[PDB]
Each structure stands twice: as structure tokens, then as C-alpha cells.
Write a protein that binds this ligand. Structure first.
Ligand SMILES: Nc1ncnc2c1ncn2[C@@H]1O[C@H](COP(=O)(O)OP(=O)(O)OP(=O)(O)O)[C@@H](O)[C@H]1O
Ligand SMILES: Nc1ncnc2c1ncn2[C@@H]1O[C@H](COP(=O)(O)OP(=O)(O)OP(=O)(O)O)[C@@H](O)[C@H]1O
Ligand SMILES: [Mg+2]
Ligand SMILES: [Mg+2]
Lengths: 102, 119, 434, 409
């Protein structure tokens, strides 16, 4: 991982973005296995738990920008916002800030 | 009368009962023996939790399923097990051990996967 | 305080369900289920119509509670038009079910205004001559009907269903079972006489269904205490706010248990332990007693039993786990566990732990077996019914003749799970990786 | 809820849980109450003190461990209920029923219904607690036995002045998890640690150790001073046997009585005020547990040949006479045993003396077979195997000067 992160920036220093890219290359081959070698919406929740997690911070504000939601709580973040928009739960109001339902 | 209430029964269960069915079906697609022990289901449930442990969205459920939101409660390793046995869905042999006890499915396998995808 | 004593007793009577019929608590999700049951009861006692419906639902799904409320509602107006005949599947067997019907008939007929006399053959003969201005509805309450639906013969199930179609006496059979596929458990002729009326009990779907049920179980709708108006404001404040402690325990039980009688086991001791009104509002807001009840329920399992062990009890279980892990079938005895424990003491002291002799580990080995840790290899254990329990006691197993140092045992917890429930401060953590 | 909560040592949560369920009003009292807890947790101590301070509650004690089978259990319930209700209200003329007529689970409902009908002359509802101390300790135990007792209150009439109350005290954990779907308020009992075990034994054994006959006879031959002496011996016993006993109360109480007379006689006129010299004088009472408190020549050689035939294959026997000991021994034949026994015997045909020692070897349970009761020695299908450990067979071969360790090396 040291030579992989150093060759990505070859930049005179090693930034945090170069180290994160080296871990993805190592995890691409050593994963999906543990004690034995050899879908995620209902069985592995994630989508069911994120609907109550991201909306919890929005409801607490009314009692926000797209960059503030990440710092307070990013492919799954934008996917959860599009699900609530179809059910009339949130308001887009542009890409800058977000507005909750009245 | 011609309807089947087994499909709609698993869709209204809790997360602990739905996780036990999803863990049993995943073990059948790896070995293909129709006889998974009780020790393999426990190891498969913990394996799915530690998939994305570094993310804050998945660790919110680990504190409840293993500590119930309490620091004094230690990390745990029975309610959802005996519930499916009396409903005629899950089977369990007469064994005094809780690791090598085989678990078999009484209902069909095609109708069991439709309830997991509906959640 | 006389004001707090009247409110504490009223709040406890609502959770147990001992309220009278004129003040019963009906949930929102169960309102559409009791209406169908009330229609069958009102049609067999008033209209005198024979019916047959077998209820199907999970354990503690408000099955007997809904049937007891329907019998109490009809007894407050039509108490001389029907009788109560209750039956069980676990208590009453095949031969005892015949005498149970005749026994409950002689005691109910003398109360409105013999049958159970003789041998077993003469008792069943008088029942068929009775069941098979108005009549009297014979309400049959059958509990655990899956035990009587044996694939060998269903004699009682065939005679009970015959008292509905062919017989003119109105007989209302309300079976209560837990099997979802109760139609396949019947015979070809038993299912023919049934009306195929299977009413499935509803379950908790969304989260708002559990909040309305808890609110209806802790709200005093009667003027019996001066603290009633103050208690309703505190309960409504904590329930309407999702950031409170009461809404957190409900959401946690909704995704883990999703059962109303299960969650009611912690609200009852929370109110009874309060000394005054100030202690009741404090425990209902912070929920400090709820965290203590959850720790006690998981204190005698496989995790809580490891913390109550000494240094020798932990070294034996660790050394015995490494033998079954490195083996093929996981078989080990006292001789294999003592070899790993002896090699661990000499390895740690070489880098003073008192090494116990072989005559002292026998007491520690027998103490771990009673604590549910070492199970016998290929052992059944507790039998299902009483038939297999008698045949197993008369047969001498092979594990009782062999000595204790040659008995094949099995580990109830693998070495992978022991490394997670052991902190890094213990000295036995280095021998749990292998 | 009007009841008195006693003060139990290290049982503050367990005593408060019993007062929230057990009450004098059946409207706020559950029909089932399980008291799960292993041995040495204080289940009986927290229940006797709770019922002794409150004399308004009527509880019936029953020990299912003294009835073996489940048939006498149904007879002891109706016998103890009628006997308790007789002395409770002697001004009521009731009819005595035969408790031996309860042989079926259905007969228990009819017997209990014939008793509650003659007790309707009371004013308020009086509870009837039926404590079952040790339900899982019954011999003929099955998974369908507990299902017949949790539904007994359903068959009972609701308009009765006396309602029964079942109280179970389980011991193991897997037996409780088999009925977790019934939603029963279970009160668990965790095991004590190293700080609560020694404190319990001090407040329970100091009242009998300082007033013993041995300690009173030692001070006259050689009350605050005798209290610290008895308290020091209890603390020294627990700290020296914490690993041998664990956290059991019965395992530590037996070791105290076994070492009390040996510790009193070692006390002189100088060891009464100096506890350092007293521990060194009796060093043989804490370093070990002190445990607990003629074979024939042909019989000795027969056990040696039986150990070889049960731990070695018979296919390589034509190369020696011409770890397998860690597993179960194998079965051999009678003629296969006499062949090796004749080879290892020093300078003999198979007469009746050899078969006489072999028949006596099976009486002492030194060699196992294939049948336990009614064995046939003349049957050709019944095989024989060894039944002695390696440590026992090692000392036997050493007395006859026979090398038994070289055959397995
Ligand atoms: N007569 C009654 N009075 C008060 N509460 C009652 C009564 N009957 C039942 N209940 C309550 O009903 C709740 C749910 O159990 P219920 O008996 O309704 O379900 P069940 O499915 O018939 O039972 P089980 O699963 O044990 O066979 C219990 O927690 C109990 O408190
Ligand atoms: N907290 C305590 N304080 C003082 N003494 C205690 C305490 N707990 C238990 N004891 C003592 O422990 C002794 C032995 O325990 P006991 O047999 O009563 O416990 P148990 O858990 O009910 O047993 P079992 O599992 O055999 O039914 C009792 O005589 C009692 O005096
Ligand atoms: Mg019921
Ligand atoms: Mg006891």
C-alpha cells in the first residue's frame, strides 16, 4: 500500500485522496470471503434504515445545504434524497440547499 | 381459500425475524445441502453486519442487536427462533446443542425469496 | 399518598387486562379483527346459526384475549342462551377429550336452569345423542388444535365438525392454533365438513400502530385519581416527541421483538417500583429502569456466564476450544483438554501461576457441564413429548459406563466468539487466536 | 400495590422485581412467574425472606425433585392445596377429596374445580401461590410438560374467589429459551462475583463458627476477638479455593467445615493476635484441596492383554508377539484376548482358572461389552472391550514388572 499510494501522486507529498485509492485496489481482491472462500435493499436493509436516518437530521432543523448533511451525518446519500422526492417528502429547491415538506 | 398467507406473513415480521430467513437462504446458495446448522446461521449473521462497519449508517443497528443501546450490556452472541417453529415455516431437530443443530425449511423455497425482496 | 395509590393500581390493571367488559382496551390494528369474530358470535347465539372457524396466528398474538372479550360482552345481555365449553390441545389428550366435553356439559346445564357417568364408551354415546322458545348454542373453544390433527386418525375432529352441518343444534367451534398451514393437517373427510373459514390474525406493520397501542394501555379515561390529568399530559408529551426515551424503546422493540405482551413485561415493574408521583414521571422520561431490565434478561446466557468465571474456569474452556477447533469433528474429552491446559501454563511462566494437579480439575470440569458449556456428542437431551422421555430413561447410554476422562464432549461456543467477549486486559487473550 | 420489600444483600433488583408481580390482588398479579437462575444465585433465600416479612400472602411450597416421575407431581398439587386451604379457613365446611385420583392432566382441572366451588363464601379474592422450587430439576422431563402448566388458568373459572398462581424456579438457560414466545415475566438471577461470594459466607457462617465446641475448648486448654478470627478463616478459604470451586456456595461451604477443626487446633497463645504466624503454621490447609476424605496375578495380566486388543489393530499382531489411547477403545473377541494373554504371560493353557478371572473382571466393571442388562457370555455376536483408563492400567503393569509403554511407542 505504500508503493501504491506513492505511485498515484507521482505531487511531492502524499495526500489523503491518494491513500484511499490504494485501499480500494487491495480490497478489490481480498474481500467477499472470511472463514470460507468460494438484494441489498430488503435483505441487507441499508435503504430501509437510511430513510429514517437522513430524514431525522432534516426534521431536527425545522424543530440545509448538501455539504452540511454529509458533515452532520456519497453515492447512497443522493439516492436516498431521490426516493423521498417521489413520495412528496422533501423539496429540491435547487442544488444549493434543500427544503423539507410543509 | 386459494390464497397463501405464508407470503404475507414473513413480510410483516420484524428485522430480527427477517434477518434469520435471509441468512438461511444465503447459506443454501453456497453449499446446496438443505441442512444448515444453527452455528452457521449465527456466523453468517455477524458476517453481514461487519461488511460496512466503518460506515456510520450500518453501525447504528449494531448497538441494538448486540447491546440494546446500553454500555453495561456486553456484546451478545431466542424469540425469533421459536416463533417460526410454531408457525409451520421453520423446522428444528431434537438436539441438546445450539451449534450443530440442523435447521430445515418446511415451506417452499420459491415463495420464501419473494418476501425478502419486498422489504 | 392516597392519590398515587389509586393511579398506580389503575395503570397496572390496564397492562394486565383485568379491566371489566365495559372498559376494555381495543387497539387500532386489532379493531378490524374483533369485528369479524363478533359477527360469528352474534350469529350463533342470537340468530342461532351453526358456524366453524379456526383462528390461525403466532404466539401471543391476542387470540385468547379476543375470544374472552366476546364471551364477556354476550354474557352481559344473553347469559341464558349459550354455554362455555373450553378445550385444550396440550392438557386434554385423545382419550381425555371425550370425558372433558361431558364434564363441562353437566356443570353448565345446571347453571342455566348423568352425562359423564359410566365407562368411556357410554360417555361418548350420550354425547352423540344430545348434540346430534329456542335452542342453546354450544360454543366450543378449542385451543392448540394442531395437536389433535394427527395424520393417523382424527376421531374428535370428525365428530366435532359433524355437529355443524348435519346436526340441527347450533354449535360454534372456535379453534385456536399456531400453524399457518392448518388446512393440510386435516384429513380428506375432516376438511370436507369444514367451512374453510380461516381468519388470520393481523400483525404490526408500520411504526404508528405500536405507538397507539402503548398510549391506549397507559391512559386513564376515568376520574379516579387527582393525578390522572397530570399523568396524561406527561405520557402524551413523551410519545409525541420522537427524540424522547419512550419512543426509542418502542422503535427498538419494533425491529427486534414486535410483540405487545413482550414489551409489557418491562412497563409493569417500572410503575410498581415508583414510590410517589415524582418518581413515576422521572422513570417515564429518562427510562433508567428499562435499561436495567434489558441487562438482566441477557445476564444468564452464554455471554453473562463467562464474566462469572475465575481464572481456572476460563483457562479450561479456552484450552478445550482449541482442541475441537483443530480437530475434524470437534470431539474432545478430559484427557485432550488437560494436555492443552498443561502446555499453556509452562509456556507463560517460561517468559507464578499455580499449576493444579489432575485431581483438582475434575471439580472444575463438572462445574462447566452444569453451566451449559460442554454438551455430549450425539446426545438428544430433552425429549419432545412424554413418550420418548420414558424410553430414553430405561436405556443405559454408552456415556455413563465409560469414565469421565474418556467422554466425548462438544463446545457450545467456538474460539472465534470467545475472542470478541474477552477484553484485552486479560492474560488469556493471547491463547485465543490459534 | 401494598407490600413490604425486604432488604437482601446484593439482591436489590431481584427483591424489587418480586414485589412488582407478587401481590395480594389477583387483578395486578400475573398467572405465571419464572425465576430463572443457576445454583448458588440465591433463589430460595430471596423468596423465603420475601414471604416471611409479609404474613398476608398465602404461598404453597412444592419440591418436584422429590417426586421423580410426573405422575406424583399432579397428586402433590391437589394434596397441598386442599391442606393449605383447610387450615386457612377452619370455619368453612369443605369436602375432602382423594389426591390419588389425579392420574391425567385433565383430572387436575376437575379436582381443582371441585374445591374452589365450596370456597365462594369469602368477601375479597384471595390468591393461592403455588411455588414450584425446581421445575426443570424433575427426572422425566419433556418439552411438552411446561405447556400443560402455563395454560391451567385458562380452564379455571374466571368467577372464582381463589385463583391459583404458578411460580417456577428454573436452573439452566436453554430450558427457558424453549418457551420465550409465551411472553412470561422472567426474573433472572446472575451469579455472584469474588466480592459478593465472600461477603455472603461471612454473614452466614460467623454465627456458627465462633460458638462451635472446638473453638471454645481451645481457648481454655492453651466476643469481638473471636469474630475477626472466624472472618479471617473464611476470607483465606475463598482466596485459596476461588479457582477450584469457582463461584458456587455449596462447593465453598464444604471446604470450610472440612478445614475448621484442623485450623482451630493450630491456634495457640501467640497465634491469637498475630495473623501472620497463624497462616504459616497451617500452610497445608490452603495449598491443596486435601482430596475429599490386592489383585490376582492372572487378573492383573488379563487387563494388560485387554488394553492392547482394545487400542491396537489385529492385522499387525503377527509381527510383535510372533495416540489411539485418547479415544474410545475398540471391541475384540474372546479368542483374540487369550492369544495375547498367553504370549505376555511368563513361563500355560487356557483352563478354568483363566475364565474364572475373566468373569470376575467384568463384575467389577473393569471391562465393558455390548450389553448392560441380561448379558449372554456364550453368544458369538457379543464382543468385549476394555473399560479402564490409562492411569489405572499403568500402575497395574508396574506391579508385575511388565513394560506396557513400549507397545504403544
Ligand atoms: N382473560 C384475560 N384477561 C387479561 N389478559 C388476558 C386474558 N387472556 C389473555 N390475556 C392477555 O393476552 C396476551 C396475549 O396472549 P393471548 O392469550 O391473547 O394469546 P394466545 O396466542 O391465545 O396465547 P399463547 O400463544 O400463549 O397460546 C397476554 O399477554 C395476556 O396478558
Ligand atoms: N444475598 C445473599 N445473602 C446472604 N445469604 C445468601 C444470599 N444468597 C444466598 N444466600 C445463602 O445461600 C445459601 C444456599 O443458597 P440456596 O441453596 O438457598 O440458593 P438457590 O439459588 O435458591 O439454590 P438452588 O439452585 O439449589 O435452588 C442459603 O442458605 C442462603 O442463606
Ligand atoms: Mg391462547
Ligand atoms: Mg433452591
Amino acid at each position: 500500500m505504500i508503493r501504491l499510494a506513492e505511485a498515484h501522486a507521482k505531487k511531492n507529498v502524499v495526500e489523503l485522496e491518494d491513500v484511499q485509492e490504494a485501499v480500494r485496489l487491495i480490497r478489490s481482491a481480498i474481500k467477499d470471503y472470511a472463514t470460507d472462500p468460494k438484494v441489498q435493499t430488503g435483505k441487507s436493509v441499508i435503504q430501509r434504515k437510511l430513510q429514517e436516518d437522513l430524514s431525522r437530521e432534516i426534521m431536527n432543523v425545522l424543530k440545509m445545504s448538501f455539504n452540511e448533511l454529509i458533515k452532520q451525518i456519497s453515492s447512497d446519500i443522493q439516492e436516498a434524497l431521490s426516493r423521498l422526492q417521489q413520495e412528496d417528502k422533501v423539496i429540491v429547491l435547487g442544488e444549493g440547499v434543500r427544503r423539507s415538506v410543509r | 381459500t386459494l390464497n397463501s398467507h405464508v407470503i404475507t406473513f414473513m413480510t410483516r415480521l420484524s428485522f430480527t425475524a427477517k434477518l434469520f430467513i435471509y441468512a438461511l437462504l444465503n447459506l443454501m446458495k453456497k453449499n446446496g445441502s438443505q441442512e444448515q446448522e444453527l452455528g452457521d446461521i449465527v456466523d453468517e449473521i455477524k458476517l453481514l453486519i461487519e461488511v460496512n462497519g466503518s460506515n456510520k449508517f450500518v453501525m447504528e443497528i449494531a448497538k441494538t442487536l448486540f447491546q440494546q443501546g446500553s454500555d453495561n450490556i456486553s456484546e451478545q452472541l431466542d424469540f425469533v427462533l421459536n416463533q417460526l417453529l410454531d408457525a409451520g415455516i421453520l423446522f428444528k431437530q431434537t438436539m441438546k446443542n445450539d451449534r450443530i443443530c440442523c435447521v430445515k425449511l418446511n415451506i417452499s423455497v420459491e415463495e420464501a425469496k419473494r418476501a425478502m425482496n419486498e422489504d | 399518598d392516597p392519590g398515587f395509590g389509586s393511579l398506580q393500581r389503575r395503570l397496572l390493571q390496564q397492562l394486565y387486562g383485568t379491566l371489566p367488559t365495559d372498559e376494555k382496551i381495543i387497539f387500532t390494528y386489532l379493531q378490524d379483527c374483533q369485528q369479524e369474530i363478533d359477527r360469528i358470535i352474534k350469529q350463533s347465539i342470537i340468530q342461532k346459526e351453526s358456524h366453524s372457524v379456526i383462528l390461525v396466528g403466532p404466539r401471543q398474538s391476542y387470540k385468547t384475549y379476543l375470544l374472552d372479550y366476546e364471551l364477556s360482552l354476550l354474557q352481559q345481555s344473553y347469559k341464558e342462551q349459550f354455554i362455555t365449553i373450553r378445550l385444550n390441545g396440550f392438557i386434554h389428550s385423545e382419550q381425555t377429550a371425550i370425558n372433558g366435553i361431558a364434564t363441562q356439559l353437566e356443570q353448565q346445564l345446571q347453571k342455566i336452569h348423568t352425562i359423564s357417568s359410566g365407562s368411556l364408551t357410554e360417555v361418548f354415546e350420550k354425547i352423540l345423542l344430545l348434540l346430534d322458545i329456542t335452542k342453546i348454542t354450544v360454543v366450543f373453544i378449542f385451543d392448540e388444535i394442531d395437536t389433535f390433527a394427527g395424520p393417523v386418525r382424527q376421531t374428535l375432529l370428525y365428530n366435532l365438525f359433524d355437529m355443524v352441518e348435519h346436526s340441527r343444534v347450533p354449535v360454534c367451534i372456535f379453534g385456536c392454533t399456531t400453524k399457518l398451514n392448518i388446512l393440510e393437517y386435516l384429513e380428506k373427510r375432516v376438511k370436507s365438513r369444514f367451512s374453510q373459514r380461516v381468519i388470520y390474525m393481523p400483525q404490526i406493520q408500520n411504526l404508528d400502530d405500536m405507538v397507539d397501542a402503548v398510549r391506549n394501555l397507559l391512559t386513564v379515561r376515568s376520574e379516579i385519581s387527582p393525578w390522572v390529568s397530570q399523568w396524561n399530559e406527561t405520557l402524551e408529551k413523551e410519545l409525541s416527541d420522537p427524540r424522547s426515551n419512550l419512543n426509542r424503546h418502542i422503535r427498538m422493540n419494533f425491529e427486534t421483538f414486535r410483540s405487545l405482551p413482550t414489551l409489557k413485561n418491562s412497563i409493569i415493574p417500572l410503575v410498581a417500583t415508583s414510590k410517589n408521583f415524582g418518581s413515576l414521571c422521572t422513570a417515564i422520561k429518562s427510562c433508567s429502569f428499562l435499561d436495567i431490565y434489558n441487562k438482566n434478561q441477557l445476564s444468564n446466557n452464554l455471554t453473562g456466564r463467562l464474566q462469572s468465571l475465575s481464572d481456572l474456569e476460563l483457562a479450561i474452556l479456552i484450552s478445550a476450544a482449541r482442541v475441537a477447533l483443530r480437530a475434524k469433528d470437534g470431539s474432545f474429552n478430559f484427557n485432550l483438554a488437560y494436555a492443552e491446559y498443561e502446555k499453556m501454563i509452562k509456556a507463560i511462566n517460561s517468559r507464578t501461576i499455580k499449576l493444579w494437579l489432575k485431581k483438582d480439575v475434575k471439580n472444575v470440569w463438572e462445574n462447566l457441564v452444569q453451566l451449559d458449556f460442554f454438551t455430549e456428542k450425539s446426545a438428544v437431551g430433552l425429549r419432545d413429548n412424554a413418550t420418548a422421555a420414558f424410553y430414553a430413561s430405561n436405556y443405559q447410554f454408552q456415556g455413563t459406563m465409560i469414565p469421565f476422562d474418556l467422554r466425548s464432549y462438544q463446545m457450545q461456543i467456538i474460539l472465534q466468539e470467545l475472542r470478541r467477549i474477552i477484553p484485552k486486559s486479560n492474560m488469556y487473550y493471547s491463547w485465543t487466536q490459534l | 400495590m401494598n407490600v413490604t420489600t425486604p432488604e437482601v444483600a446484593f439482591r436489590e433488583y431481584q427483591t424489587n422485581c418480586l414485589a412488582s408481580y407478587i401481590s395480594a390482588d389477583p387483578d395486578i398479579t400475573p398467572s405465571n412467574l419464572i425465576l430463572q437462575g443457576y445454583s448458588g444465585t440465591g433463589k430460595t433465600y430471596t423468596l423465603k425472606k420475601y414471604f416471611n416479612a409479609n404474613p398476608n400472602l398465602h404461598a404453597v411450597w412444592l419440591e418436584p425433585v422429590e417426586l421423580v416421575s410426573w405422575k406424583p407431581l399432579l397428586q402433590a398439587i391437589a394434596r397441598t392445596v386442599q391442606y393449605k386451604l383447610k387450615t386457612l379457613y377452619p370455619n368453612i365446611p369443605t369436602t375432602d377429596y382423594d389426591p390419588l385420583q389425579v392420574e391425567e392432566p385433565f383430572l387436575l382441572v376437575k379436582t381443582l374445580h371441585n374445591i374452589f366451588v365450596q370456597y365462594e363464601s369469602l368477601q375479597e379474592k384471595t390468591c393461592l401461590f403455588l411455588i414450584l422450587d425446581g421445575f426443570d430439576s424433575l427426572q422425566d422431563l419433556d418439552a411438552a410438560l411446561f405447556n400443560k402448566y402455563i395454560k391451567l388458568n385458562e380452564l379455571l373459572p374466571k368467577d372464582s374467589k381463589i385463583n391459583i398462581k404458578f411460580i417456577y424456579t428454573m436452573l439452566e438457560t436453554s430450558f427457558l429459551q424453549r418457551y420465550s414466545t409465551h411472553c412470561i415475566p422472567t426474573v433472572m438471577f446472575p451469579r455472584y462475583n469474588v466480592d459478593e461470594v465472600s461477603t455472603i459466607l461471612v454473614m452466614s457462617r460467623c454465627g456458627e463458627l465462633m460458638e462451635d465446641s472446638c473453638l471454645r475448648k481451645r481457648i481454655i486448654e492453651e466476643d469481638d476477638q473471636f469474630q475477626n478470627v472466624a472472618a479471617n478463616f473464611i476470607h483465606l478459604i475463598v482466596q485459596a479455593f476461588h479457582s477450584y470451586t469457582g463461584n458456587d456456595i455449596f462447593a465453598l461451604n464444604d471446604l470450610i467445615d472440612f478445614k475448621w477443626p484442623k485450623y482451630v487446633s493450630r491456634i495457640t497463645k501467640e497465634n491469637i493476635f498475630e495473623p501472620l504466624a497463624l497462616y504459616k503454621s497451617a500452610i497445608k490447609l490452603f495449598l491443596s484441596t486435601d482430596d475429599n476424605l490386592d489383585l490376582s496375578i492372572i487378573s492383573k495380566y488379563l487387563l494388560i492383554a485387554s488394553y492392547i486388543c482394545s487400542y491396537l489393530e489385529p492385522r499387525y499382531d503377527a509381527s510383535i508377539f510372533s495416540n489411539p489411547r485418547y479415544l474410545q477403545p475398540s471391541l475384540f473377541a474372546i479368542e483374540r484376548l487369550l492369544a495375547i494373554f498367553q504370549a505376555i504371560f511368563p513361563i500355560m493353557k487356557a483352563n478354568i482358572e483363566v475364565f474364572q478371572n475373566l468373569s470376575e473382571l467384568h463384575t467389577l466393571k473393569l471391562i465393558a461389552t455390548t450389553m448392560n442388562k441380561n448379558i449372554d457370555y456364550l453368544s458369538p455376536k457379543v464382543r468385549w472391550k476394555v473399560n479402564v483408563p490409562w492411569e489405572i492400567i499403568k500402575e497395574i503393569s508396574e506391579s508385575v514388572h511388565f513394560n506396557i509403554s513400549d507397545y504403544f511407542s
